[PDB]
Design a binder for this molecule. Structure first.
Ligand SMILES: Nc1ncnc2c1ncn2[C@@H]1O[C@H](COP(=O)(O)OP(=O)(O)OP(=O)(O)O)[C@@H](O)[C@H]1O
Ligand SMILES: Nc1ncnc2c1ncn2[C@@H]1O[C@H](COP(=O)(O)OP(=O)(O)OP(=O)(O)O)[C@@H](O)[C@H]1O
Ligand SMILES: Nc1ncnc2c1ncn2[C@@H]1O[C@H](COP(=O)(O)OP(=O)(O)OP(=O)(O)O)[C@@H](O)[C@H]1O
Ligand SMILES: Nc1ncnc2c1ncn2[C@@H]1O[C@H](COP(=O)(O)OP(=O)(O)OP(=O)(O)O)[C@@H](O)[C@H]1O
Ligand SMILES: [Mg+2]
Ligand SMILES: [Mg+2]
Ligand SMILES: [Mg+2]
Ligand SMILES: [Mg+2]
Lengths: 110, 357, 370, 356, 50, 359
């Protein structure tokens, strides 16, 4: 009957906690809400006043300047140049001859 | 007194700076035989209805001007030339788009000042933070937005075209599979209400499916307007499960926890700890009971064993974006930040890029 | 897939070759109980490494296995490497070639011991030992230049030609990040803020990392700091207490250029850079001046590259071309260099194989690694 | 009439509440479907899987097969007609016991069920609600300190060294003797040899010396093939592994040491109650002399004036089950059962609350 | 017969946590707590009046 | 270098290492001499030899026996060399000057410690909870104190001492159990009754109502099995026993109960700090371990204080050892390291230095 719509509705009612999480039953005073909003506001004004610039954040390696493809390009080019530079690498004797390795017995293990 | 306008894909939230909650919340629809929002929904039978904001980005400017007009005049009952206006925008909003927003605000509505803030950033501000990672899931779009010192990190932003509307649709489909028929728009509204009232996110999905099949403990009852009574079982948690398993609706995309983790990983390693300890959830689609605990579990499962994980999900989060704006526009130090009408007159639409960042 | 491990005095950086950034970064500390616990039995969990050790710092005494870049406690080092392989990277060491980094002027016996321990204890199929500053140089795509590598425990000037570090011209300075943190604590304490506790020391370290910078003109910056509150910045402590920091922002890292600030008689990093360049052959000096690469956390201060440019320009011949290279990623560039080097195809012959080690012993590293 | 089911890593013990002994005891193996002894007979034709390893259920389908065999084949009962007390390992995960409950109610349609910790049942079997249990079975060994029927999770010690490992070690030492023991049947023979002839030495060094001085410790076992073999120090070197796990390359402490550690993790005030109440349970505690050795070692570790008592009844091989049998037959326990109606109302969550 | 008597006298889990028999927090939790208390103590003893 | 912490109870010595969460060794403070053994070993040999109590009502009275206890503490229980460790000792409230001076002299000269400190037990109890202001109820084996403390300073003028504690409660439980007809006259019997008190007693929230409940049904009754296997049933004795703390008249004492003495202690303090005292009642000692005592104290203090005063009773489960814990924390603070009295300083000033250095 109607008492069955009511019985089915009563059986379904959530906990007070459930309403609380759904923001139907507040967990604090309007005063406490005001306190909180004020604290938030002042913290915010502080951090905003201290807020760094975009370039300051780029030099910190947080704000990435180069696009994905451009970065991939620089990485590839770095690999390339490093390989080409490492292959063309002289001998310890070649350097000792060129007055570059001033000390004997340095890199002689090679 | 400044105004705050959060332009949702589904709902416009509008109000006055300094207030704890928005004065008016209404669906973002435009009806033509012009009707906007609630009135359009009421007149929905007589006329076809169109969504000006889809997936968080403004696509129809005439309709958007109609929405803003309805907002100022019908909903808030104010004269736009008498109030600074803070508008919200989606993450990764195109330059031309925000430029057009600025142009329309100054030329059409003659505001003395305005500002455009990223929704996720405002969400972060509402909790009193300027650094952390925001999961903003609304009606039309979901974002992961990592933010350092108020700056959104564009390279690490994740966009997912899976949100509340999609969850409602999925719920209609699975309820239909159970044998209750929900094809019409009014029936759709009923299903949306069912979703909002009865759905939740299971902590362990397999165990919850097994529980739902083993007993009636999870079953709930919904009384339709016709007085018909329906029973909903696993649909309660199968519906929002789609957020973690988008494959439920045929998407190949990763779930929200995986996108949170990936977004975190795309950021520099040094700030990463700061990101893990500050997960802020915002938007209506984050309102499901149990979602914070599930996110905690999944992120804990993905992150390093010793990493500190904190999920921030206040009960007020459904409107937290707006709240952030409400706080920001009421700060004294913000007053200089506004784009003034003189400045706009001098620089044009270009000024928003320089002034807002 | 090869592994890359940069063994810092303060921080261990570990990860996989080919990756853009290290997977794991953790403090290089080994913690052992102060007194025998109430727990008997073989297989006890004696010793804590890294983050867990720092968290557990109250219960147990903490030891620095690497001081001023050189490994001094081998058991603890074995603990760190074990934690690196199993806990941090989650890998089996016998399944991965391993590139380790070492400090400049690392003793022969020391690296020999490193190789011996890696092969006998961890049964790696292959390994290599590279100089940190050299890897830093490689990360920028160079094989010739002079590197300033300033970390937690030690700072080095290392001139390098064609991939070869020039040992006779290397400069070592025992002034680094840790010393700067201590100095910042001292000057903040002089200001009336008490930073005596370890937690307070960590907070001061964070202040140093977030708010400090290197003044281009120190006297002028002191004058600006005395003239107005324009340089002053504010730091919010974890307890929500708020403090204001002024000239300490630039007085702290100024110690790098004026070590006398902490009572050291040593020349500054610019003077040691200059001296290092001068100890090299005249013919290579031009190549060194045009390629100053900065690496390590203590080079992360904003403005340090510009100041270095100014000082080196002031020391060098009037017509000398000076270029200071200090990319944003430099804090990890050492590791990055390694990640690149170990991922090169041409490097594949370079690994010391377990077989080669079997044939020659610890001795092999000297011939194979250079 | 209620049922009692102890789900061992090696052996399932099943029976009726109120009975002195389990009606059916059989190995817990699944063959691919064949279960237990019958599975072992067909073991050659088809591969066999161990659903329970180290006391925790890992293969639920196989577990369902085992439970089906238990209800229908071994006990000859209809599961819907009997309340069922199941056992679980110490530190058993929440999801695991939830799954046990789910399967019991949904698959077998039992009118009621309960889940009890094995070590606790072992303790109850000795008429205690407070003490420390050493439960050593086929796959895993635990130290479980218990106060007023409550297991203290923070102080539980787990050791993955048990009877099967000891059997393997005995096989190894037999290889050292010059006897070849590679086959499964041969493994069974070695297990029987271990159960019949092994013992725990009171003083290991002295016993080694005795074994070296004469053939006095040597014993003879007649194989099924009628071959006769001689076993010497292997008799006590085998269970010595429990006290010196280093014998099989484990770095873990021995069982006396884990007992001491378990006692030390508890509040100082209860330690006296723990020391005076050591209950040993499980098949791997059946070795003659084990109680005396444990007494000596615990006395050696504890304060000089502390009272030490080791409790190890002859029935201990099945004492876990026995405890359950007692527990399910108490009148005051009848309220404790999770009824099918209650499970229907609250779901799997109820087991955590109702059973403790 | 003694068992049931001992079962009638069983404390509640709370009642056991009250006796400091069952921990109410993980080891890590107790550690963080100890560190906090310590820093508090430090701060208060620092500004201790004469 | 690791500091040591020694809490010298009238009944139990709690000893351990600074930084540890709990005392390593806890043992009875008895010294045994043939008609030498200390603590548990002395208790085991109690039949063979006569026993002397070095600490009575929290104050040291027999110094040789105390030296024996300290030796046993360092060498037998903790296994340390006293010259290798700074040592924090505890003392009772209102401890005489000569007494603490003697403590210092013995610590430096006899045990050759590099450093030492003497702290008030109640102050350490307050510190363990991270507080420096509040009122402590410290009830041990031999003596009970109320000690109000502001910013680490105990307020001597407001301290209350009550010679009713755990041992007296054990005796009373023996008496009332005896009245029921179970005979507990013997010392061994005293020990079984003490265990009964620890396991089964609790503090009633409303004493009269609980008496009425005990008279109305068998619901409060519990059963204890004696070592002889005899089984006894205990009813109201469960809550009548610790009620003596609130109603000392139960054992013929004229003193006010602990709630009344708490109130009086609070009243003897300056009115301005009184609010701070009410909101911070810390309970410590074994005799505060009875379930329900915090709630009862809350009710009574609320009943005596002004109606709107905020009352908070702090009684953590670990409280039985909280004194020691405080010391462990205090001695483990970096800023405390200067606070130690060094052996050099002791050489310079003698026993006198402790008064100036410790407060
Ligand atoms: N209590 C609730 N539980 C679950 N979902 C809810 C709840 N309340 C609202 N929602 C869902 O949240 C959506 C609206 O969220 P929100 O207002 O944040 O979106 P929006 O801001 O308009 O869209 P966008 O963020 O894409 O611009 C609705 O689709 C609705 O289905
Ligand atoms: N942004 C920053 N500004 C200033 N200092 C920083 C910054 N980031 C890190 N540091 C400092 O750099 C140090 C870590 O640098 P790095 O990891 O290169 O040293 P390391 O390799 O461990 O030491 P070493 O090179 O001596 O072995 C830390 O002491 C830290 O204080
Ligand atoms: N008399 C005996 N002497 C020595 N060992 C024995 C004896 N009886 C049984 N065992 C061993 O004990 C094991 C079986 O004991 P039990 O039934 O307690 O194991 P379980 O409970 O199945 O194992 P778990 O507790 O790990 O699940 C077998 O491995 C067997 O070898
Ligand atoms: N759970 C409990 N319930 C009731 N009483 C207990 C409990 N545990 C211990 N006690 C009592 O607490 C007393 C021990 O207190 P404590 O060790 O603090 O005294 P003490 O410090 O030696 O004495 P004092 O402080 O006078 O020097 C014992 O007499 C014992 O009866
Ligand atoms: Mg939104
Ligand atoms: Mg380095
Ligand atoms: Mg078992
Ligand atoms: Mg005391």
């Amino acid at each position: 009957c109607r008492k069955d719509s009511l019985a089915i509705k009563l059986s379904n009612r959530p906990s007070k906690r459930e309403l609380e999480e759904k923001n139907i039953l507040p967990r604090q005073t309007d005063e406490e809400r005001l306190e909180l909003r004020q604290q938030i506001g002042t913290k915010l004004t502080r951090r905003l006043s201290q807020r760094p610039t975009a370039e300051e954040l780029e030099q910190r390696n947080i704000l990435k300047p180069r696009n994905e493809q451009e970065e991939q390009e620089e990485k590839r080019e770095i690999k390339r140049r490093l390989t080409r530079k490492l292959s063309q690498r002289p001998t310890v004797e070649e350097l000792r001859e060129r007055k570059i390795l001033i000390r004997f017995s340095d890199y002689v293990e090679v | 007194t400044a105004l705050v306008c959060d332009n949702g894909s589904g709902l416009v939230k509008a109000g006055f700076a300094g207030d704890d909650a928005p004065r008016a919340v209404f669906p973002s629809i435009v009806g033509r035989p012009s009707y906007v929002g609630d009135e359009a929904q009421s007149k929905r039978g007589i006329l076809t209805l169109k969504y000006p904001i889809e997936h968080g980005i403004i696509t129809n400017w005439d309709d958007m001007e109609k929405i803003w007009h309805h907002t100022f005049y019908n909903e808030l009952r104010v004269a736009p030339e008498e109030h600074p206006t803070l508008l919200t925008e989606a993450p990764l909003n195109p330059k031309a788009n925000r430029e057009k927003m600025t142009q329309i605000m100054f030329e059409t509505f003659n505001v003395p000042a305005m500002y455009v803030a990223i929704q996720a950033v405002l969400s972060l501000y509402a909790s009193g933070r300027t650094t952390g990672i925001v999961l903003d899931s609304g009606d039309g779009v979901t974002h992961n937005v990592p933010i350092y010192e108020g700056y959104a990190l564009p390279h690490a932003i994740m966009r997912l075209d899976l949100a509340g509307r999609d969850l409602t649709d999925y719920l209609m489909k699975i309820l239909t599979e159970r044998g209750y028929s929900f094809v019409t728009t009014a029936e759709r509204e009923i299903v949306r209400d069912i979703k909002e009232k009865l759905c939740y996110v299971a902590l362990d999905f397999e165990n919850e499916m097994a529980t739902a099949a083993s007993s009636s403990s999870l079953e709930k009852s919904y009384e339709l307007p016709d007085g018909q009574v329906i029973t909903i079982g696993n649909e309660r948690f199968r519906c929002p499960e789609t957020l973690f398993q988008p494959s439920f609706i045929g998407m190949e995309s990763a779930g929200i926890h995986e996108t949170t983790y990936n977004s975190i990983m795309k950021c520099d390693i040094d700030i990463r700890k700061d990101l893990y300890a500050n997960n802020v959830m915002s938007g209506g689609t984050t309102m499901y009971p149990g979602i914070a605990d599930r996110m905690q579990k999944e992120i804990t499962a993905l992150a390093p064993s010793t990493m500190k994980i904190k999920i921030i999900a206040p009960p007020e989060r459904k409107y937290s974006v707006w709240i952030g704006g409400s706080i920001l526009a009421s700060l004294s130090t913000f007053q200089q930040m506004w784009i003034t009408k003189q400045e706009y007159d001098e620089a044009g639409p270009s000024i928003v890029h320089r002034k807002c960042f």
